Amino acid sequence: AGEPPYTGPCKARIIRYFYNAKAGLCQTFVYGGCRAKRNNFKSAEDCMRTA
């Protein structure tokens, strides 16, 4: 959850959440649609809890 958001190699535009370490919250980023890493959540609440 300290790792940077990973868009991945696929080219879809899927809005996902990642925990922005140096900010203290969950923010949206564009996920490409495949090969998700763990700092990638479908909701803000999912994101906040897991961090």
Partner: protein
């Protein structure tokens, strides 16, 4: 599409947007009731928007139809992206006309060196984000299989084809998946994956539609 040009209003009548609240992937109309796209664009609820030029303004030319059946290729692999193709059956047939038309499925596989037209509403920048309102187009060549393999050692299967320019500067990007790569009037590719957008020696790789014509036709018939 990074480094492309605005497509002339409805010069690409087979292009569709896949929408679940916002645009997330493109696709192609292959007959009045079916759309082909990429299997990684799967969502359980999809609305297909046809006749779009400006995705953020109601222009009055669009038809919005919900997807009744979504069928991924049975051998789609989520990690290698092998067989990344998906068929969508529309709830009702669309009204074909000026702005909404079908694209033909391929006669044979197009050879390396064929020029192709790629289109989509994906990100326009290789670094940074700038999503266009208007459909973008790009003209780029199918590359030889060997160059495709040398750019991505070990990740290219026989169901994939590379298109682009190995010196970078132009290519599809997030928001373009599922979209058409039309070469000489036939749908030869489906936008799938690549590392980065428009980076030197990382060309775009597409699902090779010519390997799936019989799966497509046989699925539309059984359904």
């Amino acid at each position: 599409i990074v480094g492309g040009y605005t497509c002339q209003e409805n010069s690409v009548p087979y292009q569709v947007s896949l929408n679940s609240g916002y645009h997330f992937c493109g696709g192609s109309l292959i007959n009045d009731q079916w759309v082909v796209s990429a299997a990684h664009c799967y969502k359980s609820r999809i609305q297909v928007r046809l006749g779009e030029h400006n995705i953020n303004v109601l222009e009055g030319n669009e038809q919005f139809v919900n997807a009744a059946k979504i069928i991924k290729h049975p051998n789609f692999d989520r990690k290698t992206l092998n067989n990344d193709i998906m068929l969508i059956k529309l709830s009702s047939p669309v009204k074909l006309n000026a702005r909404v038309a079908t694209v033909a499925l391929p006669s044979s596989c197009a050879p390396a060196g064929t020029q192709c037209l790629i289109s989509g509403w994906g990100n326009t920048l290789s670094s940074g984000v700038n999503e266009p309102d208007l459909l973008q187009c790009l003209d780029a060549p199918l590359l030889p299989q060997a160059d495709c393999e040398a750019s991505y050692p070990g990740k290219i299967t026989d169901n994939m084809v590379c298109v682009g320019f190995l010196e970078g500067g132009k290519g599809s990007c997030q928001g373009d998946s599922g979209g058409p790569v039309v070469c000489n009037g036939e749908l030869q590719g489906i936008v799938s994956w690549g590392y980065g957008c428009a980076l030197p020696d990382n060309p775009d790789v597409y699902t090779k539609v010519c390997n799936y014509v019989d799966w497509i036709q046989d699925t539309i018939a059984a359904n």
